[PDB]
Amino acid sequence: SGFRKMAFPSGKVEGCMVQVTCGTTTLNGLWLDDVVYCPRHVICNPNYEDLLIRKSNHNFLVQAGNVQLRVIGHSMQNCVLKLKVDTANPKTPKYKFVRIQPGQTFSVLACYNGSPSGVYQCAMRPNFTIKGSFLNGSCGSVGFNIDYDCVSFCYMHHMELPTGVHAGTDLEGNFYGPFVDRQTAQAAGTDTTITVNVLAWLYAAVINGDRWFLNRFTTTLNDFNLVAMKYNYEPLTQDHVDILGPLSAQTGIAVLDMCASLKELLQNGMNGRTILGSALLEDEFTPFDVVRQCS
Amino acid sequence: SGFRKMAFPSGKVEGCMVQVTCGTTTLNGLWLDDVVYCPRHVICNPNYEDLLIRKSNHNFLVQAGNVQLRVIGHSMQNCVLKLKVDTANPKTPKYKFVRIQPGQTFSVLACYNGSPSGVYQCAMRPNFTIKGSFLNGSCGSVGFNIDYDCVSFCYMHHMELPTGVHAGTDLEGNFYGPFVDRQTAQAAGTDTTITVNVLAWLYAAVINGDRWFLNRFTTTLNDFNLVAMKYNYEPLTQDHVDILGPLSAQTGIAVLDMCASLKELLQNGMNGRTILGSALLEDEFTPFDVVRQCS
Ligand SMILES: *C(=O)c1cccc2c(I)n[nH]c12
Ligand SMILES: *C(=O)c1cccc2c(I)n[nH]c12
């Protein structure tokens, strides 16, 4: 019983975190086999190809705890620097670089000066920002999922935007969203609520005995989607209805009956009631998150 | 910027988690130096001294990943079993066994069959329960804080109570609260809201630019405490006012001015507004948690 924002155990990622310094700029890197990955900003209008051609291997200080790693090669891939080192990280887990979709969740290991500070779950918002928790020095901190023994790295932290939300890249240095790794007027676009996640979370609440918000009513996909649009919820698709199948089955509540409940919650609010300890409709749990945690 | 329920990085604890089996009962243990700690329930009205005297070392299967640990001694300390093993855990961190107070937070590493599944933050409620997330098999999962390099273990998971909340022990096997490790009519007592934490979190919101709920008003400790009692909030003490000092100073808001804001929030509710992404007054962040995460 119970329902928490649960992160993956961070051990496998902690053994990969290093400190990278160039000049008087320090930030975090990720040490997998004999490569260290970090934000190319570590070498800072800028023209990064110009800035990098002016560097040598000896201009990069990499520290894994105490041990200094010798840099023997450097190259840029999009917004990430790859520092080749003379030692394979003996703690390298099985890993993959995957890009996630808006609406998907991942764990963030927040790190300062190469030292892990804390782990929390995040969703990629529809507007390709994340509502993270990051202070000066967290640049290079990574986001990940773990399946069996395999770490799927999906995010590397770069920027804080003016609304206090966060912007970064996948591990091949491609930004999520229309953001750049320099100072501009850039701002988060308008965001939406992740409908499939809100329905997943209502399923979690049912599995955990919160049933107050249910009703005998139903609706069609199309009449649901007309109320969705009105309250800045993204459209529900048949794929979404299909991925909610296993939760529908476990609870005996049709997806379109759960939609009728959500329409009533959006039209009436909660009348001072809570669901799974929240007074608002939570949208940062995926169907997979609910199945992973509930039973 | 941002404010998340952040857990400690779990690596140091993951390297200590083992599986313990006795008969057909399996649960989790904690392997520190040459001792394994687990819930004595693993040997299950029961009379545990009777049950334990009937066991031998060979009746305990301890598995650290694949490696079977040889049990060379067994003893009971309150509700915890101590299995002496022939090998010191080479991954033992610096550690302490500390008992926490109601209102204090800790990280939970939820584990199944000796394998870590997920990490989340919990508070010890005033009624000495925790609102955890635990499924069958999580028995033995531990709660902890980390200071520098030192793991302070504070909780070992035992029971789910009929409201779906959780009960366990400190690492010397002394229960938090008036609970026993057997089936009875036992239930959580009435709970209260942790006032000092709610004020800490309002400070976090200010540090992060949520200031809508502030007012020009003040109150005394005693007039605050009269509204506290009415809404099932615990009393605020001068110690509490003292521990809020550093957050008061950083924000320039007197503790008793923040109390006046809280009284208004309790009397009026939020009028459909949010604070740090919540529509209700959050009480599971300590003053230390806010200082740790904010700046
Ligand atoms: C990390 O701190 C980081 C990464 C990319 C761009 C920037 C900027 I402008 N300031 N810090 C950055
Ligand atoms: C762990 O599962 C555990 C610990 C203590 C007591 C009990 C009981 I009764 N069922 N499971 C227990």
Ligand SMILES: [Cl-]
């Ligand atoms: Cl790999």
Ligand SMILES: [Cl-]
């Ligand atoms: Cl120690």
